[PDB]
Design a protein around this ligand. Structure first.
Ligand code: ATP
Ligand code: ATP
Lengths: 208, 209, 209, 208
């Protein structure tokens, strides 16, 4: 049970946080595991009924359950120890994606997580897919999915502005760099390949 | 997926029923291409006559002290509700009228679970130009409200009328305390339904399987 | 007979897990001739999958306020432990990682009975050359730790790495306050296991029966 | 119930105290009783469950139980009176071997035992089976069991340095003589044959 790679996506409503979470999970897991393998946690059910050791697991709206059944669920989901979600299936997902409304986290033991959090991104519609709806700025969904040519990675069936920082922007809350969803994926994939290169060097050290 | 839910709160005789019907007729005519509207029989555990209509209307949520309250929370679900009559519930739009100013159901212990389930939460009342006094109370002058005034403001109407305006009939967004017309309501509900569909297609295609 | 017990105390993210595995892989490869390692599933009364592996590892002794503490004292016994799944426990080496600095179990009233049962009692921590700061805390730079540096220092490794040295990863004997490498630990645990076997043969042969 | 012959083996760790205790018990009892007959007391169990009147009985680590459940157990084990260990089987062993870490004994009634103690030996590896292990001097176990010729007594299957003062040394704490394990045995055996010669002269005195 190695530590999973964690991406947290921060943002306001109608910026595509959940769409992105899904499309980050499908595309990282398709690229490495070779297929989509996504479990989406249920909202307000401390029941991972449906979990079949999928490659990627999604949490919607961390820091929305007033009690904290989440956060703890989340904390357990990345301790190198063995979580056992209720039903006895074990928790093994190599990628965890969680979305939240909070610009930062404040639920005492929060910084003890923040090492666990590999990538911290704030999401907001890019300048040429930003629309207004009921007076709010939101991702232009109709414009951001129009096909715009050959896919920028094999796991995509085509390109579109959703995939480019002109359409949707991911601001790395630590490097303060601003990347596309494709970048978000590539970085997540690199880091996993690294964790697998290291792990292989560790189980090949002592001979068999 | 999961349905767009509109709640029309408001006094009685303010056009709760009427707007809930024109909303469901107008959205489904805009999006489906023809009207498609299921009116749930109140005082019926059984969804007799459900034919997987696009829009479904619930008259008077908040009664039978708690069938409706829970048949509601079922209807709005990611999972596949099987009503008593078997058949899945597949409606993309749910309009529910109610009398209360806030909701705290007695069967649904967690009534903050119902609240992320409500896309738009409006309070209906007659507008200044369409409010007559009928036996000492203020109600909607319906006959004035539906008198043709000219070109439909959207193609799914066959003419304009004051009902469509906020001088005739008013909707207070109960979250942005913003006051909009029935047409505004219909436009915003279409935007969402369509935004949802287009996202759903993306989540299902685009990344190879 | 009775097993050699190693306890690896130490902070988390210091290579407790990792060294406990390389110890068990390396000893059993040195002595048995092939790796032979049972990892006890934490949160399991049942030793599901015990196949009489040479080495058995216990991750995180000191939890469930007291199954593990007693399943421990069983495992280390002259008598023949029958775990829940029947089959005898026959492992010659037991590695147990823990978080505490000392042991005073709550089920095992006499916790000075556990202590003659612990052959080696180590405290693990990253070494000076392999300790990066990760989010304000000091942890083991694993990737540096396992980077090949040359010839294996013992034949059961396929190369040397800093993990094997006390610049990479440090073990404080908690009894001689002596500070040794992972290789030192493996060598000392082999010496004992082999010393035990050879004594046992003597006690069973040599005097006629 | 005649008094048993008692050997106490003093020594530091890794000098073969317990190995010796076992091999002294097996070899004295095999020589006289004609078979191995060894009971090893359990550690921290005032329960001689397993005791079936074996010829020799072994105590490990006298002066290690802080309470003194030992010592008393030990004291009772050599009073000519009848000990009854818990279960009602009686205690009859003609040889008692006990090991300890203490260079001397200090647990008030200790000298009252010390008559009971026939042989007091301190054990330490002999000069050509002494090894270093984690910086400590210890008995070279691999070297001390290599067969070195025909056994020096019939109850042994061969000779080895374990059996010789070059391999393992027993210092008689009273004669300050230094003997081998084979000597330790021969002396223990002689003394028992003597106790049996005397006893026979006592039950043959009055005619039948
Ligand atoms: N502009 C907006 N203002 C307030 N709430 C909104 C807005 N747009 C959508 N919502 C509602 O608020 C919730 C939060 O939206 P969120 O961004 O988490 O969903 P998404 O799938 O990432 O994007 P979208 O809202 O476009 O579907 C949604 O469930 C939606 O019903
Ligand atoms: N050099 C040493 N220093 C400290 N403790 C040791 C050493 N060697 C062994 N031990 C441990 O201390 C205990 C005391 O050893 P003791 O001499 O009583 O056992 P033995 O059977 O006589 O000899 P050995 O220790 O070689 O097995 C043993 O149980 C062993 O686990």
């Amino acid at each position: 049970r190695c530590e999973p790679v964690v991406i947290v996506l921060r943002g306001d409503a109608g910026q595509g946080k959940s769409l992105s979470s899904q499309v980050i999970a499908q595309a990282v897991s398709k690229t490495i595991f070779g297929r989509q393998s996504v479990y989406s946690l249920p909202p307000d059910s401390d029941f991972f009924d449906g979990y079949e050791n999928q490659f990627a697991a999604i949490m919607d709206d961390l820091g929305q359950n007033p009690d904290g059944s989440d956060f703890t669920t989340f904390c357990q989901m990345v301790s190198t120890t063995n979580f056992l979600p209720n039903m006895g299936t074990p928790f093994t997902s190599q990628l965890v994606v969680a979305t939240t409304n909070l610009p930062e986290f404040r639920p005492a033991h929060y910084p003890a997580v923040e090492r666990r959090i590999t990538f911290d991104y704030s999401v907001s519609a890019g300048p040429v897919c930003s629309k207004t709806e009921a007076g709010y700025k939101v991702l232009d969904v109709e414009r951001a999915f129009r096909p715009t040519g050959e896919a920028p990675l094999p796991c995509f069936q085509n390109n579109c502005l959703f995939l480019e920082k002109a359409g949707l922007q991911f601001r790395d809350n630590r490097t303060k760099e601003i990347i596309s969803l494709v970048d978000v994926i590539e970085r997540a994939v690199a880091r996993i390949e690294r964790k697998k290169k290291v792990l292989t060097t560790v189980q090949t050290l002592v001979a068999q």
